Structure formats: C-alpha cells, structure tokens
From a paper:
The protein [name] (268 amino acids) was identified in a transcriptome study aimed at identifying genes whose expression is enhanced when this organism was grown with CO as the sole carbon and energy source. The biological function of [name] is unknown, and a BLAST database search shows that [name] belongs to the DUF4392 superfamily (after domain of unknown function), the members of which are found in all three domains of life. To gain insights into the biochemical function of [name] and its homologues, we determined the crystal structures of [name] in four different forms; the apo form without a bound metal ion and the Mn2+-, Mg2+- or Ca2+-bound form, revealing that the protein has a highly conserved bi-metal binding pocket. Our analyses strongly support that [name] is a novel Mn2+-dependent phosphatase.
Intriguingly, in the crystals of the apo form of [name], two protein molecules in the asymmetric unit also formed a dimer-like pair, but they were in parallel orientations. The intermolecular interactions are also mostly hydrophobic and bury a surface area of 1,778 Å2 in one subunit. The binding interface involves α2, α8 and α10, whereas that in the metal-bound [name] involves α1, α2 and α10. The N-terminal segment corresponding to α1 in the metal-bound [name] is disordered in both molecules forming the parallel dimer in the apo form. The helices α8 and α10 of one molecule interact withα8’ and α10’ of the other molecule, as if they form a four-helix bundle. Probably, the parallel dimer of [name] is the biological unit in solution and the formation of the antiparallel dimer is likely to be caused by the high concentration of 2-methyl-2,4-pentanediol (16%) contained in the crystallization solution that probably disrupted the native hydrophobic interactions at the dimer interface. The apo-form of [name] exhibited no detectable phosphatase activity.
Author numbering:
A (entry chain A): 12 to 270
B (entry chain B): 12 to 239, 242 to 270
Amino acid sequence: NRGVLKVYLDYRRKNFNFLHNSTKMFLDNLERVLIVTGFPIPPMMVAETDGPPGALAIYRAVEMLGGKAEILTYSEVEKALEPFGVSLARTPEPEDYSLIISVETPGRAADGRYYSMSALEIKRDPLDGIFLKARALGIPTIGVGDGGNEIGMGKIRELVVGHVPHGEKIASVVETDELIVSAVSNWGAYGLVAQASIEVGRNLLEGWDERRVIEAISSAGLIDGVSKTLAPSVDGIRLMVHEGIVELLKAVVDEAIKL
Amino acid sequence: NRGVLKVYLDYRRKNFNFLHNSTKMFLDNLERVLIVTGFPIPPMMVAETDGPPGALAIYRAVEMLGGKAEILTYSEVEKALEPFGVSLARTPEPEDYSLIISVETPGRAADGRYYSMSALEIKRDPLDGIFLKARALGIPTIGVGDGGNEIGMGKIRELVVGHVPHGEKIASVVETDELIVSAVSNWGAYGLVAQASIEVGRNLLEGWDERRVIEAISSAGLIDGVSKAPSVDGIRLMVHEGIVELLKAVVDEAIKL
C-alpha cells in the first residue's frame, strides 16, 4: 500500500488520538450544522457510495443532541437519501451555520481542477466553494476523506504530494479546521459519532443499519467508487465488512457509556 | 501461424491481461453504444459470419447493464439480425454515442483502400469513417479483429506490417483506443462480455445460444469468411459452442465464488 492513511498515522502529531479534536469541535458547535457530501466518479461522473452513509450518521447525531442539520449534496444523492427524510439545504450560505462538515467531497487542486485518485478530471458543479468561504469567515469546518483529493486534505497536502500517486496533481488545497483521515470515509464519520457518543454518554449509533443504508443508496443508483461490482458495496469492500466495523464501534461505545 | 495473434500475444505490453482495458472502457461508457460490424468477403462481397454474433452478444450485454445499444452494418447483416430485434443505427453521428465498438469491420489501409487478408480489394461502402471522427473527437472506441485489416488494427500496424502476409498494403491504419485481438472476432467479443460479467458480478452470456445464432445468420445468407454448412472462420459449429460454454462455466464459477 501507498496511501494517505499510512503516512498520516505515522507522522501526525500524537498529542491526541486522531478523532479527538474533530469531536471537540463537533460537540461545541451543533446549533446548525451543514453537512456536505457527494463524490462524482469519472468518467461517468455518478456519485459514489462512500460519503452519504457517513453524512447521514452525522446528521442523526446532530439532531439527537438537540442541534439542527441540513445536507448539501448532488441531485442523485439527494434522491438516494430521499427515504431517510433528511433536510436538504437550499442556497446555503456559510454565515447561516455554526459548523460545516464535508464527508468525502471533491476538493479543488493546486491547478484549480478536481481530480479522482487516478488523476481523471471530475466535471460536475463543485461543492467546496462554501468551505473556502467558511475558512475566510472563521466558521468551524471539519473534513473527512480517505484519498488526498478531498475537502480538508489541504491540511496535509505535503504528505499527499510526497507519498501519494500523482500527489502534486490531485492533492487538494482546500483546508478545514479539523481533518479526519480513514480507510473508508463512512467509517471516519462513524468514528466521530462513536467518539461523540462516549463523550456525551449516549450511543448515537444506536439503531444504525449499515447494510440497509448501503443497499438503499445503491438501489437509487449510487455506485462503488472503486470497483465495478453491481452488488451494494463501498470502496471495493463488501457489505459484511461494513456491518462488521459498525458493530465493533457500537459494542465498544455501549460498553463505555454503561460503565 | 504467420498471423498477428501470435506476435501480438508475444509482444503486447503485459501489465494487464489482453482484455482488461477494453472491458474497463466498456463498463465506463455504457450510456449509448454504437456497435459496428459486417465484413464483405471478396470477390462475392457478401458479409461474413464472423462479427455479427459478437456484436449481438455485446449489444445484449449493454442492454442488460441498463444502457442503450445500436447496430450499424450492411443490409444483408441487418436482415440476418432482424429476427433478434436489434435497434438499427439511425444515420449515426459519433457525438450521439458514449462508446463506439467495431467487431470485425474492414479498416482502410495505408493507401486509402480496403483489403481482405488475401490482398483482394474490398468494394463496398466503408464503415470505418465514424471511428476516424470519434478518435478526433475523443469519443471512446474499441476494436475487435483477427486479421490486421480490421478497424482498430492501426494500433499495432507495425506488428501486422512486419509479421503478416501482404502486411504493408492490407494492414489497417485505423486506430481505436482499445484493441482486442483473438483467433476469431466473435470469441474476442464473448471474452469482453465474459470479463465484464465477472467484474460486474452477473453472467451476461446467460442464455446465449451460439449454434442458433450462427445457423440463423448463415441461413440468412451470410457466408464463412475463410472456407465457405453454418460455420465461422472455417471452424465447425461444435467448436464455437465449446468455447462459449467454457466462458459461461468460468463466469458462472467466478460470480458465485
């Protein structure tokens, strides 16, 4: 392997665990959260299955905590999320939110373009603009990504450039206050929810049906961003594996809050 | 064989198996596929049985995967494919398609003409024009051929020119993004569909009756392009059904694994 996660975990400041600060920022700014997600996969430019499940999980947590959330994403993803009854953000402006979060969303590169991990150019209307504005405004932002070309990855751009294939070209320059790097962005989101959970003594993952969420967005047309498999999946990893890690997080969370 | 298959398999770059990248381009551009086929055999100038079956198998795969397929071919081939209810190319313009595929279709040579493997000149309105336009437009193109004079063989012209009889003159200069070379073009097409089946997880060769399709187009008037019973490339019906069954069995195993 030669990905971002590998080197990031080796050379990141270890004063705290990798989710700590994102959790801190998350819990302190729940008033009105804007959650961005959606990653068009070239050449077809159809949104993938990694990101939406994560965004939905964070969405739930926000409201379970008395806050209010909205989702900013592409049309095909809005449709895939239709069955879950999530509030869709219309004409969102950064000043209207206390926190803005990106779950696996394309981030413009140094050349002003958006690239997939294979250096194929993405041609869809971008969603990172609102994040550049937030940073300029001083509005808290958190990004979750697993490759190096996502919103929030500007925070560790030298890492991507120096250890990731086509780093110079695909590494995004879009920074976020806090960044979450994982093997699967959905997991990264669930990690934040799990840590927020033990933090507030509530299991915010309770009732999360991983298999059902993936199968639903898959049915709606959302594709795997890594393989051509027609079966419901995420990043070339089978359903069994995704339900598997969700259960580990649920179980560890449950044990901790029941202490 | 003093053929192109032999040398192509020896010297093509092997970072990936020989079908891999066409399969990739195939699945990545299923929106609306124009499938071109039909190869006139001189001196009679009637289209042969190698090409149409392959096109039909890909045509079906595209539809099964939810895309739209269309066929541009000679009239005798249209009549031959009529009983299978395929949509026929409506004055095609490359811009209308996300992918253009050629299954054993004549490709112009260095001198602007079209040649059979035996070096006899083909005299029939050309069908390679649209692939030339597609390359200039950046529209995905895949070529399937077994001789070196077909649309797509321009990709390995030097190989054909230096290792195939009458190389210089018959070798096609018509290039396609991805080329599939096989002993029989119908088979190269089935290989594409089979590889696509595996990566997608569905047996796209499901229900393909190889003997039926060859007998149907043959009785429709299409001839064997090599030896001219219903056959393809001088190879007996049984052998064709045999290949298809091997591809079906291996696919079946892989998708249930």
